[PDB]
Amino acid sequence: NIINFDTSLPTSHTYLGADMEEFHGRTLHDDDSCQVIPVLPQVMMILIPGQTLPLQLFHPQEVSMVRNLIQKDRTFAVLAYSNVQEREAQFGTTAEIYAYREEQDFGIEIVKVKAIGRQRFKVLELRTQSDGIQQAKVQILPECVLPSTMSAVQLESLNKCQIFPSKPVSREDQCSYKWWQKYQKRKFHCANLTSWPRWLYSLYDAETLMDRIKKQLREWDENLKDDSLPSNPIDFSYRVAACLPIDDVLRIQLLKIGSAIQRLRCELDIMNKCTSLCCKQCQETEITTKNEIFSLSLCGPMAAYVNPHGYVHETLTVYKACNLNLIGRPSTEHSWFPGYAWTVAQCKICASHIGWKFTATKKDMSPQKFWGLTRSALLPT
């Protein structure tokens, strides 16, 4: 099922605004060194690079910093806070501004800005400024890319038999199990010179790991092959890491890794060894059905969404969610999705403010089969 809804509008966040002032992206950094960057407070979320984030700011100090940044380099630091609060952070990710809008209307501060992370860095000490926008020293962490594992011992003879033909058709049986055997037998042909077999080198390759991740993802949900999954291992790893339902400590551990292959192996291990989900205070929940989780968006099952009253909020698009209670009529005055009506779905035991059931609005839609969860009270077990 595809429930006949375009999944590119929830990524653009139409509800936030319409007449956006687009900012063209050109920005990089020192490339393995250090810099200094303003930090926006009142935000607590680890931002994997490539993940979109919308922001809503009300106090004068941060909006003044926003205008100053707009008339400057477009970058601000979001420190990945640990479990302990009160500036107990060591790693942060920079954020880039690609769209801005005032929409002052009544007017207190009122800013309509969406941001995406670009790079990773570490903080030595958190310098404090009395203005309100603390600035920190920052060592731009490296992005280490590794060459092919077979390039060290490669023969000068069979150098030419290393560019394989493209995949046969796409996403078909007997065109992958048959083709991957030939791929492994031909690409890693010089594995006999070293003291290790071919499959061991296959465990530390880039293409095979990405194919396995893609197969697992399509086993989860109906993904249209190359539905905005970049062929580059870096961006693919970042996107898949962003779209997984994992705790914050494991996410910061993934952020710690600086190499694509190690990150992919660790992520594969994590989502292979993670099956169950919990309701924080509650002992257990029906959300354990990790297999039955589709993605009603182009960014994945998870994305960053904002509320009209403050802090950014997290979501999880699950097909069915039991152990929940529904309160309030279905309303869509401020909906995270254009053609959906949101209903505040509370819990059944702990009664936490987690869950949002979406009902039918049109004919070719999903009638009363949609939910949005919260990682604040959701933890893998």
Binding site: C144, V145, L146, P147, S148, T149, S151, A152, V153, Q154, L155, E156, S157, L158, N159, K160, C161, Q162, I163, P165, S166, Y177, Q181, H189, N192, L193, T194, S195, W196, P197, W199, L200, S202, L203, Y204, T208, R212, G258, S259, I261, Q262, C266
Partner: protein, 817 residues
Amino acid sequence: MSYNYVVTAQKPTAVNGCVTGHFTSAEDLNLLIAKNTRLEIYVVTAEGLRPVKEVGMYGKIAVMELFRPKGESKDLLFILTAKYNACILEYKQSGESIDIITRAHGNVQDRIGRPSETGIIGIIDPECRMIGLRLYDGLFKVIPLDRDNKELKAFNIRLEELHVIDVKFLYGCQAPTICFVYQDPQGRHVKTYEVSLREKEFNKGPWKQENVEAEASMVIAVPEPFGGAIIIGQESITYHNGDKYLAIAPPIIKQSTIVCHNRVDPNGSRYLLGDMEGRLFMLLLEKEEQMDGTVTLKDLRVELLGETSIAECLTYLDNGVVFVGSRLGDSQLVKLNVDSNEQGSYVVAMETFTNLGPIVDMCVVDLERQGQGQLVTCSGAFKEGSLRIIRNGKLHIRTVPLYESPRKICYQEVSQCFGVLSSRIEVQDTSGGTTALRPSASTQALSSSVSSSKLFTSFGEEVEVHNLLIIDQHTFEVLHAHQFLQNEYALSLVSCKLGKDPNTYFIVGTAMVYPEEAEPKQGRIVVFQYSDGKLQTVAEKEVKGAVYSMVEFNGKLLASINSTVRLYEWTTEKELRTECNHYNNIMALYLKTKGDFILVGDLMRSVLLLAYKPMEGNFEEIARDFNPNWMSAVEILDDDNFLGAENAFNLFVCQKDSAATTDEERQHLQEVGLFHLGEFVNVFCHGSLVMQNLGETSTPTQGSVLFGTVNGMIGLVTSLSESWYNLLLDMQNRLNKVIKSVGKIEHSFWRSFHTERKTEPATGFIDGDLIESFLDISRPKMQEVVANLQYDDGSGMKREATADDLIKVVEELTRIH
């Protein structure tokens, strides 16, 4: 703070390129063999090959083609190094001190750009108008060649296609022409460009792009008067000339594809083709057509000649003698007699040059009466694997062929027999069985056995069947051949005694592999016990994972199942028992131990250290080191320093600083020494080739670690005293201003730490070859070598330092190998 000393004992013998041309003189015919860091110039005669020179460059040879610019009497030589140290060498006989002067030198690498995935390609215009290269994707580098060009300035030219398979210049054209095949989603095509030097840009090719077979790999340029290029694929050998087009699909070359070639005639009427399986094809061109003075092809028949060593680079010498240069086997010199035909084979062996590599695993054994030591290696691969014995008393090397690839080795003494694993190729016949291909050493043993345990396709596909051989140390004949179950893969092998038991047990760790699943799920540890010429399975334990490497602890057995390091205790009931576990974040591949220190590595450089506290009985984690690189082999030099190899043929030494006053610094491993060895290291093992006499005061060297390499050279890395390192560093930094290397490549470059992302100067390592080369330098230059060395540190200085004292110093370091 490492003070290590790396020296080369047996010079590398692998071959990665051979060309012929009138190099030494216009009348002689030379066979320049490019091995690796060394270059050898031979002279062909009626009897065979007569060596002339052994010249060693400061780099790895990657491109070597001979060209003859106008106005030259003898052919020059063009050599490109992996580190892009381009140079043009010219041979010159000066009396009897034959030296190779350097015509030009200069780096050609670009500041930014990923190296091509296919690899470096070197091509030269037949008219010697320019020199071509392909170093980075989409950048076909061109180096103009002129008498005034003594710096090798290169200008990039943009290639319209990124994935380029093979590019080689064409013959018989007024303007320079290239003919290359590229990869596109719509398929593979052959397209040509007319490179112009004046415009420094491409042009329109003589003949348009033509579709080719989906497995086009290698391109041969046919010389005059035919013209055009021959595109050889997995199934067909084609020919393109624009209007003309010939293609044939013989079934003989169907089994394996062709990877190497070399012309045999000035007009290219016949050709040579080699493949991985190891058979020498013989392509023929029919030139009987002659319409109006032009010559065109009529037939592309392919005729097989016979089976030789596994080809890496061929060459056709005079009088029908073909140098079948191998890389993973043994080099040969076959004769193409078309009149013998003993049974249908056109090739007969004449000579055999020893080729140690590719070494896979090693052991040091005193096979004589407790005298010297003897590096019993596991050379070869595919059908040419063999056991080599390397003594020190020039190194003498005797071969024991097995016709089967060996993986590891170990030497039990209380049964005076060797234990070597093996892996031979078995073809899947359409009957459910496993029929062999050739008589291998596993099927010709005195006895045999087949493992039978109950604890748990297509006709044409190949399946690997593993064996564990037992070889006597005297006759070197196979005595028994134990064979594991179907789809079982042998990884580890250790010969050690366990617990209080008096016997010596062969232990083999195996991990089942299935095509369906990616990583192994269940493995097996089997404990054999050789006695009275009969292998018996005393014990058998199953593990949910893969057994990657194993060692012994003074009566205990240690194994690394998947990502967990496990300790096994040998009980009195002869059944392995688990004692303690340590779940690691990495997958433990290498286990090297010394005392209570455990050096747990992986394939991604993540060196991790462990210490086994006996009072508590569980592992404790001491040191950490994380850095993304491909670590090849790791060895523990001493109680503190750990040695290993990593990407770009480098050597690194890590040191743990127990003197640090903070816990944050103690839990981290410094990088003290980095070195660019120039070889890929496969295995490390303790021991030395020289008699281990006490020697009263011994020598400045202390300790001994040997390493084997893919190219097959034996090195001896040791430790040094504090002042000796500074003295040797000063001597080495003064030697660079006396000796003149070939190509002018600077020593610090050929030894600088190299990586695709970062390069730093080498420290903590003394090059043993540069120091050992001092004894060959002429006496008058020795005065310039040393003038203020401050020779003694202990008890005097002798500022003058004379000249004879340094000779004694170098000889003491040379005596170790």
